[PDB]
Amino acid sequence: EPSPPSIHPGKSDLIVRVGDEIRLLCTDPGFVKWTFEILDETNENKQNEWITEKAEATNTGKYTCTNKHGLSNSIYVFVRDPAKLFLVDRSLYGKEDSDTLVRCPLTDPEVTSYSLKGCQGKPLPKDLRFIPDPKAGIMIKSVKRAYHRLCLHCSVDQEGKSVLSEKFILKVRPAFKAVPVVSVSKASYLLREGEEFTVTCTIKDVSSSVYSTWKRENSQTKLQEKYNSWHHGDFNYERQATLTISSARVNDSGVFMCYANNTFGSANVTTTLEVVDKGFINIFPMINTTVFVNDGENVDLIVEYEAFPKPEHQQWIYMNRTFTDKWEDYPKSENESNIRYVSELHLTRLKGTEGGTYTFLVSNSDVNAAIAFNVYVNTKPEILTYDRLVNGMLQCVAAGFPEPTIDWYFCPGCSASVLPVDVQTLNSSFGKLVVQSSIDSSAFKHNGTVECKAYNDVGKTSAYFNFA
Amino acid sequence: EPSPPSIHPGKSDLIVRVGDEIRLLCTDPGFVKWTFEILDETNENKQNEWITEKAEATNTGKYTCTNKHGLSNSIYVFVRDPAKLFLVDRSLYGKEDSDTLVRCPLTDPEVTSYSLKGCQGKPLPKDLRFIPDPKAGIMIKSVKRAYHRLCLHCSVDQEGKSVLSEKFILKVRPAFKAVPVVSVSKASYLLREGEEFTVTCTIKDVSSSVYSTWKRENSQTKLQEKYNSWHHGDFNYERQATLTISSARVNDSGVFMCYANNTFGSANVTTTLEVVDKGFINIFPNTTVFVNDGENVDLIVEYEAFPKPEHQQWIYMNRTFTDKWEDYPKSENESNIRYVSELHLTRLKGTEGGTYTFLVSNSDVNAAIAFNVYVNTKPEILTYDRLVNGMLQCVAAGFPEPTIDWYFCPGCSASVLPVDVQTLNSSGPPFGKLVVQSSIDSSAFKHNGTVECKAYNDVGKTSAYFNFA
Amino acid sequence: GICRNRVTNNVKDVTKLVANLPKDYMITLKYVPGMDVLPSHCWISEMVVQLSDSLTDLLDKFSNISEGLSNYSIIDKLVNIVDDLVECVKENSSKSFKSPEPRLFTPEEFFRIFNRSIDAFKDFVVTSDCVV
Amino acid sequence: ICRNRVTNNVKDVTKLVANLPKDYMITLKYVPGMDVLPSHCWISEMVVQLSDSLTDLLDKFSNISEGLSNYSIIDKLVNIVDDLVECVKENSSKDLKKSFKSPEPRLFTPEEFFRIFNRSIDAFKDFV
Ligand SMILES: *[C@@H]1O[C@H](CO)[C@@H](O)[C@H](O)[C@H]1NC(C)=O
Ligand SMILES: *[C@@H]1O[C@H](CO)[C@@H](O)[C@H](O)[C@H]1NC(C)=O
Ligand SMILES: *[C@@H]1O[C@H](CO)[C@@H](O)[C@H](O)[C@H]1NC(C)=O
Ligand SMILES: *[C@@H]1O[C@H](CO)[C@@H](O)[C@H](O)[C@H]1NC(C)=O
Ligand SMILES: *[C@@H]1O[C@H](CO)[C@@H](O)[C@H](O)[C@H]1NC(C)=O
Ligand SMILES: *[C@@H]1O[C@H](CO)[C@@H](O)[C@H](O)[C@H]1NC(C)=O
């Protein structure tokens, strides 16, 4: 049957006074090698007899003998030197929540209090609990972020007096306990073909170690990204991968997404791009571009429109000729992504002959557009001329807009009315329409006054005649 | 007769090997004392025979023997130590344009080249010129600003090989060659009694040694000023003395002046402060305007207001109406106390006539100024009837007074005049149109024509026609 | 090309920190022999851990300054880096640990090395040329 | 007297001190018992000494463009003590050599050293 090796001294722990010999001897038919090892150091030896003539606290370790079948045994040697009562690896890192070893194994196992101490007078945090072991170190348990940069001391009391080890200053590696916060410089871009496209994402997280990436919506290809990163103190980090497209082509449009990904979660942030081959200006008015007013009335015309790039020479022109400066122009959203504008035109108290066709024009680096309004002002008829036609009647002509109505009264005048009418043709074919209507004079009554009434939705006017 | 002591060794300069003795013998009846002195040390002694057993290069000096009559003789002793071939006062300041000693006197006089060397490779400025003296040091001449912070070495050549002294670092003291540059925060102040008057003057000059003072115009009294200062590099200094009167009283008015006095010039800077017991508002506008049916007109007033003008507005017939009026300061200055407001009346309506008023106010006084806008109109033939027995009447209303002239000849018609009862009745109400009623008798020695009533006004004309037979 | 992302660019503030260090202040490093020669993987690990010790102590020799850039901050962030490297390396590359003898360096030479070490990355992989 | 000579570029001492390694020993020729009293048996010596000290200390740093370099901070502490070692050798102007034998050089941690530098600046504001 296969059995592990046998070593002499057959003790399980051996103690040597510094300056002494260490003779370890492995007796086994299948001897293969001696393997000493302390902190990181590690030696081998092909010799049943291991001997170190003059010891040193740096020999305190574990000497192990292994059989040819892979079996093994091993005694721990302690080499007591009053000077060195500790051996250390002042290196010391640990994860969040995970335990961690303060690398300070003892040289003399027979000591009163192996304990972790407050560095330089102060006291170790109340929260921190630990469990020593002369063959390793003290084992700080469950290292919390708040122990970061903490400096400890390995302590031990020899002869009533307690001694310290060199200083250890644990560095704590965070453990992701929440998803990477991620944002983006701009929300949605829009550029004329050829311009450059550039955007920068901002990944923030407890550790540089995050994973960030600029992918193109629905695609796993790789995008050329350039980035800068910082550290704003403990357990804080920020990265800025900025993506850029020098001279974007139309087909480059679409959505992009920034993705951050740690051992706990993911974070997306997109930014949609819209490249165009040429700029545009589209217009949307208020209502029908056919306005109706009344002498002395006010009215504002207002149009809205998209425009890219930003609009330039805007202006209102009455009958192909500029006039006022009483018109407002202004962006509709003030957003930093607004492409929609609106321009109002204030016509205050038109004069009737002030009617006509008002146009609005605006333009950009590319296209030029315009829209026009036909403002028809209304007026109260006017008795342009009331004469006395030849054999037969009277004629009365009035002018107004729209079509004036002509009704005739008769009774003597405070007077009564009597209807009648014959030849009425409204000649004219701009604006103001004129009408001509007359009525025969043969009523079989006399000694009175006839009146001409010209009606219009806006108002009325009249003149008086005589008969006999 | 009185005669100087007699020191032996008779030599004028003695040289001693370090570690040896220095025996000096003064022989004069009236020996008072022995006077040794090197860089700044200086030891006196009351013994005819001066002796030091073990000499050191810090003995190199000038041993002076003084008589009881105020006379004296002395020899210079160099104590050569191959270790120190220099004694030094590594202190070294110097005024501008002045000369300055680089305190590095020699230990062994017999040396090849005593010279002032650049420091750290760098070569001394081609400008600088010096003149060494083994009993002092090297004399930098006419030390200029550019030599500031400059570091030198005292060099000397012994045994073909050249040795260097510790390093001197000449710090140059400017010589005022121009007047101070003084400026003040705000030119002129103005505040309501009770507030705080604080202003701050800024002196900038080659040195902190300038003299800057806050003196109340025509008064050598001492004012309370708090000051701060800075150094912006070399030969650059800034001091800011700030003057402040917590709760200014009216008599604390007047001018204030900041003064810069330096070994070369002066600098004036004044800041006039005007304290008042209470705010105020003044207005300066014809206050009666004329227009025409359809015409536009802008009304504009200007005013001074302190504190700043609060509620401002335009009211017509004791009521609010439009918002078509601009308000704005006249200078944008940071001292402007004058403002101006316009009111825009576009295309009046005639019935729009009235007394437009403007009101503005501050934390203190209230005020306003009124305008009377009389709008004109073309006469209207309100009523052209036919009187009872004999004539025709015709009334027309307009503004101002509608002139009523009469035509007669048949109608293309001629004109004939005559005027009867013409009386304009309307005193009653406010800013309205005046109506006129004029008629004329009808006793004509001709018939079969048409008469016309004409109402004239500087704006226009209207008329109505009558009949006869 | 691995771990190159772990080196934040606070590395840029080394020149200032150096200017703010007394030209005569001797710093201690356990200089891993011949590194300055070659290659770039025979030492990187060790030197990275060391620079941390070095940096870490040098860091205690200063106090924090509110307004402005303290050498404290600068060092602090340098330390954050050399640690993350110490990690990514002993987590990616995943030896008989015999430490180099301590040596003194002006802040320039010292940080000269520091810099060279951060460059050992940007082109880091996952021992025969370690010769002479 | 001279108190006006001392500019406030002094406030920036707490910083400069914060930027010097707590173990970088500054050399100063401490004038004996100045820390006890009086305040005029030493003012002149210390004032000159300080300059020298500060002056060398200044050589150990390089100039930084963006920010406050210890260099600048020091360079300006220097400009000052120099001006004192001026107003005094011109206001006291009673330097009939009788008090010499330059103090012995001593070592101080930047904090101790600047503590002294500070007390020395205080010595004015109430000078003869
Ligand atoms: C855009 O079109 C160009 C035309 O050749 C092509 O080379 C490029 O790959 C296209 N980009 C994408 C991803 O559609
Ligand atoms: C982006 O999409 C989801 C939407 O359900 C979002 O909640 C998540 O943060 C991101 N996930 C991806 C697509 O990686
Ligand atoms: C007004 O201008 C347009 C050009 O946009 C032109 O077609 C039209 O004939 C012009 N109208 C008149 C009467 O000038
Ligand atoms: C400053 O003003 C003049 C200019 O040098 C000088 O006469 C005066 O003495 C100075 N101030 C005083 C009153 O000492
Ligand atoms: C100082 O006051 C005098 C009074 O005569 C004046 O002429 C001079 O310009 C002032 N100096 C200035 C302006 O700095
Ligand atoms: C109110 O208006 C009337 C006339 O419109 C004016 O006479 C009066 O003075 C105003 N109120 C006062 C008393 O200020």
Tab-separated table of C-alpha atoms in Angstrom, chain A residues 5-11 23-27 34 48 63 65 73-75:
chain	number	residue	atom	x	y	z
A	5	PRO	CA	6.921	10.101	3.659
A	6	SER	CA	8.333	10.134	7.182
A	7	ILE	CA	10.398	13.027	8.455
A	8	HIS	CA	12.731	13.308	11.446
A	9	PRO	CA	12.443	15.129	13.824
A	10	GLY	CA	9.063	13.518	14.027
A	11	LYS	CA	7.615	16.644	15.555
A	23	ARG	CA	18.371	19.293	9.904
A	24	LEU	CA	15.279	17.856	8.394
A	25	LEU	CA	15.468	14.335	7.053
A	26	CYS	CA	12.894	12.645	4.844
A	27	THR	CA	12.925	8.899	4.754
A	34	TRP	CA	11.961	19.102	-0.196
A	48	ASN	CA	16.506	13.339	1.843
A	63	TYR	CA	9.291	22.460	4.954
A	65	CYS	CA	8.426	16.327	1.816
A	73	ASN	CA	4.206	15.223	5.151
A	74	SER	CA	5.773	18.347	6.678
A	75	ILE	CA	6.972	20.068	9.887
